[PDB]
Amino acid sequence: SALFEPYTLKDVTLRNRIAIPPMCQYMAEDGMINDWHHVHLAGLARGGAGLLVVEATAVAPEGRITPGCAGIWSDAHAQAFVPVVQAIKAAGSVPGIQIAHAGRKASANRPWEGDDHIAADDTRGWETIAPSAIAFGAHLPKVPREMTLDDIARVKQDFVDAARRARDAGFEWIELHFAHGYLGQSFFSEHSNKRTDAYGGSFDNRSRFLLETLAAVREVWPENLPLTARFGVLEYDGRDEQTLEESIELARRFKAGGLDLLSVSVGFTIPDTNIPWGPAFMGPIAERVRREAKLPVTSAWGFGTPQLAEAALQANQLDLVSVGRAHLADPHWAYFAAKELGVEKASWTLPAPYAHWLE
Amino acid sequence: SALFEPYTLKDVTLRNRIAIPPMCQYMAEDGMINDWHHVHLAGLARGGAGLLVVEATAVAPEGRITPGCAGIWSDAHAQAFVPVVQAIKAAGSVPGIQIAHAGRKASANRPWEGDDHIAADDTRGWETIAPSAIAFGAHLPKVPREMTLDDIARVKQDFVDAARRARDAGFEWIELHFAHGYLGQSFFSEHSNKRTDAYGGSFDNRSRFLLETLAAVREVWPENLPLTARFGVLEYDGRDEQTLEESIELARRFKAGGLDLLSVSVGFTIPDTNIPWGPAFMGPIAERVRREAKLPVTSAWGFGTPQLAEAALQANQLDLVSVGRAHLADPHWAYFAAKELGVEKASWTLPAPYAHWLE
Ligand SMILES: Cc1cc2nc3c(=O)[nH]c(=O)nc-3n(C[C@H](O)[C@H](O)[C@H](O)COP(=O)(O)O)c2cc1C
Numbered sequence A, B: 001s002a003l004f005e006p007y008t009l010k011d012v013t014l015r016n017r018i019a020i021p022p023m024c025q026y027m028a029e030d031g032m033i034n035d036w037h038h039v040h041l042a043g044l045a046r047g048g049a050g051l052l053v054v055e056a057t058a059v060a061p062e063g064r065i066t067p068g069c070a071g072i073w074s075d076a077h078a079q080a081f082v083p084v085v086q087a088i089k090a091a092g093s094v095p096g097i098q099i100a101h102a103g104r105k106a107s108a109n110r111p112w113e114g115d116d117h118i119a120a121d122d123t124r125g126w127e128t129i130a131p132s133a134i135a136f137g138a139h140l141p142k143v144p145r146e147m148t149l150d151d152i153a154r155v156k157q158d159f160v161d162a163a164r165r166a167r168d169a170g171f172e173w174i175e176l177h178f179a180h181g182y183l184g185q186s187f188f189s190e191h192s193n194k195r196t197d198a199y200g201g202s203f204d205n206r207s208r209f210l211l212e213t214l215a216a217v218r219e220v221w222p223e224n225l226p227l228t229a230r231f232g233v234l235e236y237d238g239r240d241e242q243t244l245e246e247s248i249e250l251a252r253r254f255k256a257g258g259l260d261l262l263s264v265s266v267g268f269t270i271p272d273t274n275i276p277w278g279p280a281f282m283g284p285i286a287e288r289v290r291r292e293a294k295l296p297v298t299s300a301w302g303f304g305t306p307q308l309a310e311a312a313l314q315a316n317q318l319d320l321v322s323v324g325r326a327h328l329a330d331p332h333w334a335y336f337a338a339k340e341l342g343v344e345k346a347s348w349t350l351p352a353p354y355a356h357w358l359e
């Protein structure tokens, strides 16, 4: 099956096309990960997936989404990832990490603790920053502070330091979080970016923060290790054709700038939208980006059904299939998929201590 | 459903009736467990099972089944279990451990490395000990050395030290491995025990090693923590009625001796047998033992089908349902079962970081 064919990008080879997309656990303390993450990630790596991308890890304290988000804004924070990275590699999976900055969606409660912006008097909260002083709305009403040019320079450097730390911690795959309405996505979208300086207005100006951050990270990230990003290419806000055209153009600039693969998603920049949720609904859009930008891609949402994952790959809509929630339900989803697709010696998708007894 | 009703034994309360039986991983080095076990066990504990019994852990070096078996024959070996025990508890599952001695089945290769007795010239091998100098046969042809009274005293003390270490490491449930043809089972069976001293011949003499070991362990194992054992009650060797009668009588002596629960299994003492393998095939025998010995029991083999587990409990054939291989296939089997049985808020069988998104 196509789902179980290896994939090589730069000097890295994934044993199959199954990728576990970044999934926040909200279990870190002051940005420091712990045994929750170690067992969670090591267990997933042993499950069989070819690539395991660690959850959105903040490049700065205020870049966290919640008080439970992981961070890599200091060398001590990076050190915490070392044993985890080594456990993922020992399991045969490729360790990746998504570095991010929540922007105006920062300083929010954990999903099961309100999922809304933290109250002004809560000692855990903090001031959010963004391209412009405009709130997301809905459950995230906090108005962020408009970033100064110095804030921009500082955040870009935070991304560079985060990438440098990821590199030294042993990660072999990096993903810049430019999607889901967080800082990067918000600089590109006219909904959230009303700036009149070099970082707002035109397509080039709105693209600037993302392109400069990618270029800056590229200086410290090894050429032989996949350099990727997640980016929302449309919002389903009634401006889809225009937005997709601009997003694809930016994807072309990313490719020219050294991006090896693009994780295609939706913007989630504003709440007033009408997203046509459905199993593998992103397939068609991902394929269009892959084709018009001539860049490898991955996407997600509902690919937890083996046959769907297989079909998406065979149709060349995606290069890697990202499966998220199915892996929270069953860390050994790769094994379940191998069986479902009739892969020979499907049990050996898992380590010997398990495989021997399941064959 | 009955599968998800809590269970209290002594001072310990299991959140449900799902027990993960001991399952050797063959990943230890010189008896020392490592991160394979830590992630494996912690992951299983987070999966939802109410009780997690750690694999057969050798009370002495020669008591290991293979060079990859876990051991607890020294305080350093016990220390290795401390972080694991604490991770299991943090997950809400009860940490248990099966202490054992492989007897004549010791010094064998890992299952995926031959599964047979290690060659005489292999530097990893060792002399096996047993009640009598008689080999198992088949793939385990090595003739063990007949134990002296001093060997018996020493092994009993090894079990005591192992239990004392398990206690101090934080385990809240202990299981003496008197089944599957290893040392304990071999002392009870006339197939393997041809001794003429106080430890062989009569029912009382063949029961002696097991009863004395239980009594000795009882002196160091807390009264408020479940004291259990796994025991093969029949062999399917043509002497079933006679063997079951004696096994049930020994179970009565175990109960009188402080045993809180008995894990009912098959002897596997010799290779020439005809075991009627089938889903939940042990159910009827387990029920007979539970009834005639008036002792709580658990059993296993094929209970990985939610409905079967539920049925066994409702029929009072078992008090706890042991599910093994299904947990190797899917560490979150408890979640799969909760869904299958229509349990309310089935996703919360798992921790919040997973449950929130699966509901
Ligand atoms: C708990 C949870 C945490 C997530 N965390 C992240 C994240 O940190 N970064 C990101 O880009 N997407 C994140 N996502 C979105 C997932 O990566 C994925 O695209 C989404 O779950 C859809 O795929 P699925 O249907 O296979 O779950 C998360 C989703 C869930 C359910």
Ligand SMILES: Cc1cc2nc3c(=O)[nH]c(=O)nc-3n(C[C@H](O)[C@H](O)[C@H](O)COP(=O)(O)O)c2cc1C
Binding pocket: A353, A357, B021, B022, B023, B024, B025, B055, B056, B098, B177, B179, B180, B230, B300, B301, B302, B303, B304, B322, B323, B324, B325, B326
């Ligand atoms: C890998 C593996 C390791 C096992 N290790 C042990 C052990 O250490 N001690 C024991 O008493 N039984 C052991 N067993 C037997 C299991 O506890 C259980 O009774 C058996 O797998 C039948 O249940 P199942 O059909 O749910 O897998 C093992 C079985 C497997 C497959």
Ligand SMILES: O=c1ccc2cccc(O)c2o1
Binding pocket: A024, A056, A065, A179, A180
């Ligand atoms: O699409 C999603 C859903 C949940 C989520 C959570 C944290 C960060 C993200 O980027 C997320 O993206």
Ligand SMILES: O=c1ccc2cccc(O)c2o1
Binding pocket: A221, A222, A223, A224
């Ligand atoms: O892209 C680069 C630049 C410098 C460098 C130096 C050492 C090892 C690498 O992998 C490197 O990769």
Ligand SMILES: O=c1ccc2cccc(O)c2o1
Binding pocket: A167, A218, A219, A220, A221, A222, A223
């Ligand atoms: O891309 C880079 C740039 C600098 C560098 C320095 C040391 C090791 C690396 O792997 C590096 O990689």
Ligand SMILES: O=c1ccc2cccc(O)c2o1
Binding pocket: B024, B056, B065, B179, B180
């Ligand atoms: O029934 C079984 C099957 C495998 C096994 C492996 C180690 C120890 C045991 O007690 C076992 O018991």
Ligand SMILES: O=c1ccc2cccc(O)c2o1
Binding pocket: B221, B222, B223, B224
């Ligand atoms: O059974 C016993 C005997 C002594 C003892 C001492 C401290 C704590 C315990 O739980 C104990 O339990």
Ligand SMILES: O=c1ccc2cccc(O)c2o1
Binding pocket: B167, B218, B219, B220, B221, B222, B223
């Ligand atoms: O059963 C026993 C016997 C002795 C003992 C000693 C300390 C702590 C315990 O928990 C103990 O438990």
